[PDB]
């Protein structure tokens, strides 16, 4: 219906599907990478693989 993207459960669901799609197992890390990237999952892929 209308959950809170904050919780790492949803993991930004779709957004997660993307960072996950690039071979990321750190789900919680995707949700957050997405929150800090405002949707720029690609920008998140490069940064996420970086360190955080």
UniProtKB/Swiss-Prot annotation:
PTM characteristics: Degraded during both macroautophagy and during chaperone-mediated autophagy (CMA). Phosphorylated.
Domain remarks: The UBA domain mediates binding to PSEN1 and PSEN2. It also binds ubiquitin with micromolar affinity, independently of polyubiquitin linkage type. Essential for its association with microtubule-associated protein 1 light chain 3 (MAP1LC3).
Record organism: Homo sapiens
Cellular localization per UniProt: Cytoplasm; Nucleus; Endoplasmic reticulum; Cytoplasmic vesicle, Autophagosome
Name the record gives this protein: Ubiquilin-1
Lineage per the UniProt record: Eukaryota, Metazoa, Chordata, Craniata, Vertebrata
Miscellaneous comment: May be a prognostic marker for lung adenocarcinoma patient clinical outcome.
Tissue specificity note: Brain (at protein level). Ubiquitous. Highly expressed throughout the brain; detected in neurons and in neuropathological lesions, such as neurofibrillary tangles and Lewy bodies. Highly expressed in heart, placenta, pancreas, lung, liver, skeletal muscle and kidney.
Domain named UBA: residues: 11-51
């Amino acid at each position: 219906g209308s959950p809170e993207f904050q919780n790492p459960e949803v993991r930004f669901q779709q957004q997660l599907e993307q960072l996950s799609a690039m071979g990321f197992l750190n789900r919680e890390a995707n949700l957050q990478a997405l929150i800090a990237t405002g949707g720029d999952i690609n920008a998140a892929i490069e940064r996420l693989l970086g360190s955080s």
